Amino acid sequence: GAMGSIVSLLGIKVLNNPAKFTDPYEFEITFECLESLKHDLEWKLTYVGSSRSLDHDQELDSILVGPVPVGVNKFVFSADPPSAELIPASELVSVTVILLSCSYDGREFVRVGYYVNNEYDEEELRENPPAKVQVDHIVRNILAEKPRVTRFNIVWDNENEGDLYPPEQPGV
């Protein structure tokens, strides 16, 4: 029973709201397994500074599921929060984007983006930013009102292995 995509993401439940930036990222995954996966599903969270990732995109945590049976699969996914040392006080007080991405045998078919409002809940700090980032007073509010879902067409089960690894190019 291969109904196109064997795994489709029904959505994600942003449990953490309101949260802090240095507060653990907790997303609950809900997806429908059409046929029991012969391979494993890898779910991960990436933190993205706005778009091009001014903080250098960072995989906070990655989980692997199996054996994954038919039906809806649902579990809470917890990712360790990013350190503000990567994003200076004036740099993490911005809206950023979280990417939840699932890879099946190396092929990523689902990457979901969520925008996060990061600000100082204290007006005095919001208006006048301190030298040292006090992330414990920085509020992370995920705009779960707008899920950005991107689907990549991959080949499930009946795929012949050839180019499953991204061409490593000499960056910098």
Partner: peptide, 15 residues
């Protein structure tokens, strides 16, 4: 109404 909580490992791939 059914669900599946699974046990999502932390990478820990084995072959």
């Amino acid at each position: 109404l059914a669900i599946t909580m699974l046990k999502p490992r932390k990478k820990a791939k084995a072959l």
